[PDB]
Amino acid sequence: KVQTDPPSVPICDLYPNGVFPKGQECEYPEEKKALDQASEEIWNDFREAAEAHRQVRKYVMSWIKPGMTMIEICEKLEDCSRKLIKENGLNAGLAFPTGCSLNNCAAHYTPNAGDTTVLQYDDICKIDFGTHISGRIIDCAFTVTFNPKYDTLLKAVKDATNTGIKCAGIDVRLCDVGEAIQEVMESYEVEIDGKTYQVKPIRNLNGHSIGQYRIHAGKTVPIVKGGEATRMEEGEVYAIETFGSTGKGVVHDDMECSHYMKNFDVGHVPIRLPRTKHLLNVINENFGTLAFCRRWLDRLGESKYLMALKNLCDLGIVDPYPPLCDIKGSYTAQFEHTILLRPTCKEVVSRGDDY
Ligand SMILES: *C[C@@]1(O)CC[C@@H](OC(=O)NC(=O)CCl)[C@@H](OC)[C@@H]1[C@@]1(C)O[C@@H]1CC=C(C)C
Ligand SMILES: [Co+2]
Ligand SMILES: [Co+2]
């Protein structure tokens, strides 16, 4: 039909012909048109996931406010995402947990059960969430603030992400994208609570290629100079994300872990320990190689799983991804889009009218 007041109509019911809206198509900085058309069903799956992402994040921006708990924020967002993507096992769903990392924490925080953290007026919150259709994943992220003191820091990082998106292309060196992002990000100076800062890229955070059911397909997109001259290739899909900070510009692991994901390269492992075997079956059935969090195990009715989960991490079957934070007192911001390197053009598939 038409989408409802608070979104509830699945994207596939809005586009009944099964053809979803294109993102922003860009020229790069016969045969290829045929080759582009041959993968049309893949691009269409990314576009369905991207339209869900656009409609969920517009909804989130309408209601996210200080005073809400982080758990309330993530559950309200994920509810909407499950409805709009028309969650169906591993065929359509949430690609990874909702990040809502605060202040000096830049990535990989979502609340676990019992977290009483409440969003504050002065917080800078990075909302990073993913949708997929048939394993075609959209990773797209933006920063929420309520105090205008952070506006230039957000503009710096938004400009740096758009610079990396403009620089990207077939046969472009990943190191050149990094150098370009850093030049733009470091051109910004900000003043927050009477202290001035030159905005710094977080040098040990990166964008990444994306593969089917594989949020990180192994190529990294640097956000500072000095990286690898490995080239981007036709048909690849990339999350172009940049992170800016007022602190050291380096993150370390910190706080409790919430995010986990099966190692993509680990095959079947026979397990006899009963609780560990059951938890691995739950993971394989519900997530496969997609990332999950502890709240997502709780919602499936699992309990007494933390030792089984530690066991799967210690075996190397599952990897933990703890929150990544700069120094105490620092402020970090993030913007990200997913781009498709199609044969005929570069498509910023997750681009909206918002960012
Ligand atoms: C979650 C995240 O997308 C965060 C940004 C980036 O992290 C890093 O660059 N990390 C490091 O260098 C470790 Cl010190 C992404 O990796 C390039 C990272 C991502 C894709 O690897 C995780 C896997 C995804 C989930 C746990 C959601
Ligand atoms: Co992301
Ligand atoms: Co990403």
Coordinates of C-alpha atoms and ligand atoms in Angstrom, one line a residue:
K1 CA 0.0 0.0 0.0
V2 CA 1.4 3.3 1.2
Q3 CA 3.7 3.2 4.2
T4 CA 1.9 3.7 7.5
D5 CA 2.2 6.6 10.1
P6 CA 4.7 4.6 12.1
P7 CA 6.1 2.2 9.6
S8 CA 4.6 -1.3 9.7
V9 CA 4.3 -2.3 6.0
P10 CA 7.1 -4.5 4.7
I11 CA 9.1 -3.0 1.9
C12 CA 8.2 -6.0 -0.3
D13 CA 4.5 -5.1 0.0
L14 CA 5.3 -1.4 -1.0
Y15 CA 6.9 -2.6 -4.2
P16 CA 4.7 -5.5 -5.3
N17 CA 6.5 -6.0 -8.7
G18 CA 9.6 -6.9 -6.7
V19 CA 11.7 -4.1 -8.2
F20 CA 13.1 -1.8 -5.5
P21 CA 14.4 1.8 -5.7
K22 CA 18.0 2.4 -6.8
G23 CA 20.4 4.4 -4.6
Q24 CA 22.4 7.3 -5.8
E25 CA 24.1 6.3 -9.1
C26 CA 27.5 7.9 -9.8
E27 CA 29.9 7.8 -12.7
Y28 CA 33.3 6.4 -11.6
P29 CA 36.0 8.8 -10.9
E30 CA 27.6 -3.3 -24.4
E31 CA 29.4 -6.0 -22.5
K32 CA 29.5 -4.3 -19.1
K33 CA 25.8 -3.3 -19.4
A34 CA 25.0 -7.0 -20.0
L35 CA 27.2 -8.0 -17.0
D36 CA 25.5 -5.4 -14.8
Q37 CA 22.0 -6.7 -15.9
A38 CA 23.1 -10.3 -15.2
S39 CA 23.4 -9.5 -11.5
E40 CA 20.2 -7.5 -11.3
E41 CA 18.6 -9.9 -8.8
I42 CA 21.6 -9.2 -6.4
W43 CA 21.4 -5.5 -6.7
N44 CA 17.6 -5.6 -6.2
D45 CA 18.2 -7.5 -2.9
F46 CA 20.6 -4.8 -1.7
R47 CA 18.0 -2.2 -2.7
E48 CA 15.2 -3.9 -0.8
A49 CA 17.5 -4.0 2.3
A50 CA 18.5 -0.4 1.8
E51 CA 14.9 0.9 1.5
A52 CA 14.2 -0.9 4.8
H53 CA 17.3 0.9 6.3
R54 CA 16.1 4.3 5.0
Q55 CA 12.6 3.9 6.5
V56 CA 13.8 2.5 9.8
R57 CA 16.4 5.3 10.4
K58 CA 13.9 8.0 9.4
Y59 CA 11.5 6.6 12.1
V60 CA 14.4 6.4 14.6
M61 CA 15.4 10.0 14.1
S62 CA 11.7 11.0 14.8
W63 CA 11.7 9.6 18.4
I64 CA 15.2 9.0 19.7
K65 CA 15.6 11.4 22.7
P66 CA 17.6 11.7 25.9
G67 CA 15.8 10.0 28.8
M68 CA 15.3 6.7 26.9
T69 CA 17.3 3.7 28.0
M70 CA 19.7 2.2 25.4
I71 CA 17.7 -1.0 25.6
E72 CA 14.5 0.8 24.8
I73 CA 16.1 2.5 21.8
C74 CA 17.6 -0.8 20.4
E75 CA 14.4 -2.7 20.9
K76 CA 12.2 -0.1 19.3
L77 CA 14.6 0.2 16.3
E78 CA 14.9 -3.6 15.9
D79 CA 11.1 -4.1 16.1
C80 CA 10.7 -1.8 13.2
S81 CA 13.5 -3.4 11.2
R82 CA 12.1 -6.9 11.6
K83 CA 8.7 -5.7 10.4
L84 CA 10.0 -3.7 7.4
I85 CA 12.5 -6.3 6.2
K86 CA 9.8 -9.0 6.7
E87 CA 12.1 -11.2 8.8
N88 CA 12.2 -14.8 7.6
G89 CA 15.0 -16.9 9.1
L90 CA 18.2 -16.5 7.2
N91 CA 16.4 -15.3 4.0
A92 CA 15.6 -11.8 5.3
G93 CA 16.4 -10.2 8.6
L94 CA 18.8 -8.1 10.7
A95 CA 22.4 -8.5 9.5
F96 CA 24.0 -7.5 12.8
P97 CA 23.1 -6.0 16.2
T98 CA 22.1 -2.4 16.6
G99 CA 25.1 -0.4 17.6
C100 CA 24.4 2.7 19.8
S101 CA 27.9 3.4 21.0
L102 CA 28.2 6.5 23.2
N103 CA 30.8 9.4 23.6
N104 CA 34.3 8.0 23.6
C105 CA 33.0 4.6 22.5
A106 CA 33.0 4.5 18.7
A107 CA 31.7 1.0 17.7
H108 CA 30.4 -2.3 18.8
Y109 CA 28.4 -1.4 21.9
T110 CA 24.8 -2.6 22.2
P111 CA 23.3 -3.1 25.7
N112 CA 23.2 -6.5 27.3
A113 CA 20.3 -7.6 29.5
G114 CA 20.2 -5.4 32.7
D115 CA 22.1 -2.4 31.3
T116 CA 20.5 0.6 32.9
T117 CA 22.4 3.2 30.7
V118 CA 20.2 6.2 29.8
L119 CA 20.8 8.4 26.8
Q120 CA 21.8 11.9 27.9
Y121 CA 21.5 15.4 26.4
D122 CA 25.2 15.8 25.9
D123 CA 25.7 12.2 24.5
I124 CA 27.0 11.6 21.0
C125 CA 25.5 8.3 19.9
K126 CA 26.5 6.3 16.9
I127 CA 23.5 4.4 15.5
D128 CA 24.9 1.5 13.3
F129 CA 22.5 -1.2 12.2
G130 CA 22.2 -3.6 9.3
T131 CA 19.5 -5.2 7.2
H132 CA 19.8 -8.0 4.6
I133 CA 17.8 -9.8 2.0
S134 CA 19.3 -13.3 1.1
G135 CA 22.6 -12.3 2.8
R136 CA 23.0 -9.1 0.8
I137 CA 23.9 -6.8 3.7
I138 CA 23.5 -3.0 4.1
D139 CA 25.8 -1.6 6.7
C140 CA 24.9 2.1 7.2
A141 CA 25.4 4.4 10.2
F142 CA 24.9 7.9 11.4
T143 CA 25.5 9.9 14.6
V144 CA 22.8 11.3 16.9
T145 CA 23.3 14.4 19.0
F146 CA 21.1 16.8 20.8
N147 CA 23.6 19.6 21.8
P148 CA 24.7 21.8 18.8
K149 CA 28.2 21.9 20.3
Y150 CA 29.0 18.8 18.3
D151 CA 27.7 20.0 14.9
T152 CA 31.1 20.7 13.3
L153 CA 32.5 17.4 14.5
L154 CA 29.5 15.6 12.8
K155 CA 30.0 17.7 9.6
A156 CA 33.7 16.8 9.5
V157 CA 33.0 13.1 9.7
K158 CA 30.0 13.3 7.3
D159 CA 32.2 15.2 4.8
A160 CA 35.0 12.6 5.2
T161 CA 32.7 9.7 4.5
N162 CA 31.3 11.4 1.5
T163 CA 34.9 12.1 0.3
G164 CA 35.7 8.3 0.7
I165 CA 32.5 7.5 -1.3
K166 CA 33.5 9.9 -4.0
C167 CA 37.0 8.6 -4.2
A168 CA 36.0 4.9 -4.3
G169 CA 35.8 3.1 -7.7
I170 CA 36.9 0.2 -9.7
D171 CA 40.7 0.1 -9.9
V172 CA 41.1 2.7 -7.1
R173 CA 43.8 2.0 -4.6
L174 CA 42.4 1.5 -1.0
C175 CA 45.3 3.5 0.4
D176 CA 44.3 6.5 -1.8
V177 CA 40.8 6.4 -0.3
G178 CA 42.3 6.5 3.2
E179 CA 44.6 9.4 2.4
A180 CA 41.7 11.4 0.9
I181 CA 39.4 10.8 3.8
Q182 CA 42.1 11.9 6.3
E183 CA 42.9 15.1 4.3
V184 CA 39.2 16.2 4.5
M185 CA 38.6 15.1 8.1
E186 CA 41.7 16.9 9.4
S187 CA 40.7 20.1 7.6
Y188 CA 38.1 20.6 10.3
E189 CA 38.7 22.2 13.7
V190 CA 36.0 22.1 16.4
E191 CA 35.5 23.9 19.8
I192 CA 33.6 21.9 22.5
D193 CA 33.2 23.3 26.0
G194 CA 35.9 25.9 25.5
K195 CA 38.6 23.5 24.2
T196 CA 39.6 23.4 20.5
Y197 CA 40.5 20.3 18.6
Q198 CA 41.7 19.3 15.1
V199 CA 39.4 16.4 14.2
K200 CA 41.4 13.1 14.0
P201 CA 40.4 10.0 12.1
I202 CA 40.4 6.9 14.3
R203 CA 43.5 5.3 12.7
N204 CA 42.7 1.7 13.8
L205 CA 39.1 1.7 12.5
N206 CA 38.3 0.9 8.9
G207 CA 35.7 0.3 6.3
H208 CA 35.4 -3.1 4.8
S209 CA 34.2 -5.1 1.8
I210 CA 31.0 -7.0 2.2
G211 CA 30.2 -10.5 1.0
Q212 CA 27.2 -12.8 1.0
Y213 CA 26.3 -13.4 4.7
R214 CA 29.8 -11.9 5.4
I215 CA 29.8 -8.5 6.9
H216 CA 33.6 -8.3 6.6
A217 CA 34.7 -10.0 3.4
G218 CA 38.4 -9.4 4.1
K219 CA 39.4 -6.1 2.3
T220 CA 39.8 -3.1 4.6
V221 CA 39.2 0.5 3.6
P222 CA 41.6 2.7 5.7
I223 CA 40.7 6.1 6.9
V224 CA 44.2 7.5 7.3
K225 CA 47.2 7.5 4.9
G226 CA 49.7 4.7 4.8
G227 CA 47.5 1.7 4.1
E228 CA 47.8 -1.0 1.3
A229 CA 47.7 -0.2 -2.4
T230 CA 45.3 -3.2 -3.0
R231 CA 42.7 -2.1 -5.6
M232 CA 38.9 -2.1 -5.5
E233 CA 37.4 -4.5 -8.0
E234 CA 34.3 -4.7 -10.2
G235 CA 31.4 -6.3 -8.5
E236 CA 32.6 -5.8 -5.0
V237 CA 30.5 -4.1 -2.3
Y238 CA 32.0 -1.9 0.4
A239 CA 31.0 -0.3 3.6
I240 CA 32.6 3.1 3.4
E241 CA 32.7 4.3 7.0
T242 CA 34.7 7.0 8.7
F243 CA 35.2 7.8 12.4
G244 CA 36.4 11.1 13.8
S245 CA 37.6 11.8 17.4
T246 CA 38.7 14.5 19.7
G247 CA 40.8 12.0 21.7
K248 CA 43.9 10.0 20.7
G249 CA 42.4 8.8 17.5
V250 CA 43.0 5.2 18.5
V251 CA 40.5 2.8 20.0
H252 CA 41.0 -0.1 22.5
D253 CA 38.7 -2.8 23.7
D254 CA 36.6 -1.7 26.7
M255 CA 33.5 -2.5 28.7
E256 CA 31.5 -5.7 28.6
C257 CA 31.2 -7.6 25.3
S258 CA 27.8 -7.8 23.6
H259 CA 28.6 -8.6 19.9
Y260 CA 29.7 -12.0 18.7
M261 CA 29.9 -13.7 15.3
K262 CA 30.8 -17.2 14.0
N263 CA 34.2 -17.3 12.3
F264 CA 33.3 -17.6 8.6
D265 CA 36.1 -19.9 7.8
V266 CA 35.4 -22.4 10.6
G267 CA 33.6 -25.5 9.3
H268 CA 31.5 -28.1 11.2
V269 CA 32.8 -28.9 14.7
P270 CA 31.3 -31.9 16.5
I271 CA 30.5 -31.0 20.1
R272 CA 29.4 -33.3 22.8
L273 CA 29.2 -30.9 25.8
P274 CA 25.5 -30.4 26.0
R275 CA 25.0 -26.7 26.6
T276 CA 27.8 -25.8 24.2
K277 CA 26.4 -28.1 21.5
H278 CA 22.9 -26.6 22.0
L279 CA 24.1 -23.0 21.8
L280 CA 26.1 -23.7 18.6
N281 CA 23.0 -25.2 17.1
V282 CA 20.9 -22.1 18.1
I283 CA 23.6 -19.9 16.5
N284 CA 23.8 -22.0 13.3
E285 CA 20.0 -22.0 12.9
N286 CA 19.3 -18.4 13.7
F287 CA 22.4 -16.4 12.6
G288 CA 24.7 -18.6 10.6
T289 CA 27.7 -16.4 9.9
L290 CA 25.8 -13.1 10.7
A291 CA 26.7 -11.3 13.9
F292 CA 24.5 -11.5 16.9
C293 CA 24.3 -10.2 20.4
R294 CA 23.4 -11.5 23.9
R295 CA 20.0 -9.8 23.8
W296 CA 19.2 -11.8 20.6
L297 CA 19.9 -15.1 22.5
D298 CA 17.7 -14.0 25.4
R299 CA 14.8 -13.3 23.0
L300 CA 15.0 -16.9 21.7
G301 CA 14.5 -18.2 25.2
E302 CA 18.1 -19.1 25.9
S303 CA 19.4 -18.8 29.4
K304 CA 22.6 -20.1 31.2
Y305 CA 24.5 -19.7 27.9
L306 CA 27.4 -17.5 28.9
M307 CA 29.7 -20.3 29.7
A308 CA 28.7 -22.1 26.5
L309 CA 29.4 -18.9 24.6
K310 CA 32.8 -18.5 26.3
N311 CA 33.5 -22.1 25.3
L312 CA 32.7 -21.4 21.6
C313 CA 34.9 -18.3 21.7
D314 CA 37.8 -20.2 23.4
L315 CA 37.4 -22.9 20.7
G316 CA 37.6 -20.2 18.0
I317 CA 34.2 -21.1 16.6
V318 CA 32.8 -17.8 17.6
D319 CA 34.7 -14.5 17.9
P320 CA 33.8 -11.8 20.4
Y321 CA 33.8 -8.1 19.2
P322 CA 33.9 -5.9 22.3
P323 CA 33.2 -2.2 22.3
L324 CA 35.9 -0.1 20.8
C325 CA 36.6 3.2 22.6
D326 CA 39.0 6.1 22.6
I327 CA 40.2 7.7 25.8
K328 CA 37.9 8.8 28.6
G329 CA 36.5 12.3 27.9
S330 CA 36.9 12.1 24.1
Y331 CA 34.1 12.4 21.6
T332 CA 33.7 10.2 18.5
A333 CA 31.4 10.4 15.5
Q334 CA 30.7 8.0 12.6
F335 CA 28.9 8.1 9.2
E336 CA 28.8 5.1 6.8
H337 CA 27.2 4.0 3.5
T338 CA 27.2 0.8 1.6
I339 CA 28.3 1.1 -2.0
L340 CA 28.0 -1.3 -4.9
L341 CA 30.7 -1.3 -7.6
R342 CA 28.5 -2.2 -10.5
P343 CA 29.9 -2.7 -14.0
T344 CA 28.1 0.4 -15.3
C345 CA 28.4 2.8 -12.3
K346 CA 29.0 3.2 -8.6
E347 CA 25.7 2.9 -6.6
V348 CA 25.5 4.5 -3.1
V349 CA 22.7 2.1 -2.4
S350 CA 22.0 3.2 1.2
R351 CA 22.0 7.0 0.3
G352 CA 18.9 8.8 1.5
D353 CA 17.5 12.3 1.6
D354 CA 18.9 12.5 5.2
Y355 CA 22.6 11.6 4.6
Ligands
LIG1 C1 31.8 -3.6 13.6 C2 32.7 -2.9 12.6 O1 32.0 -2.6 11.6 C3 33.3 -1.6 13.3 C4 34.2 -0.9 12.4 C5 35.3 -1.8 11.9 O2 36.2 -2.2 13.0 C6 37.5 -2.2 12.9 O3 38.1 -1.6 12.0 N1 38.1 -3.0 13.8 C7 39.4 -3.2 14.0 O4 40.3 -2.8 13.3 C8 39.6 -4.1 15.2 CL1 40.8 -3.3 16.3 C9 34.8 -3.1 11.2 O5 35.9 -3.9 10.8 C10 36.5 -3.4 9.6 C11 33.9 -3.8 12.2 C12 33.4 -5.1 11.6 C13 32.9 -5.2 10.2 O6 34.4 -6.2 11.8 C14 33.4 -6.3 12.6 C15 32.4 -7.4 12.3 C16 31.0 -7.0 12.6 C17 30.1 -7.1 13.6 C18 30.6 -7.6 14.9 C19 28.8 -6.3 13.7
CO2 CO 28.3 -0.4 10.4
CO3 CO 30.7 -1.3 8.8

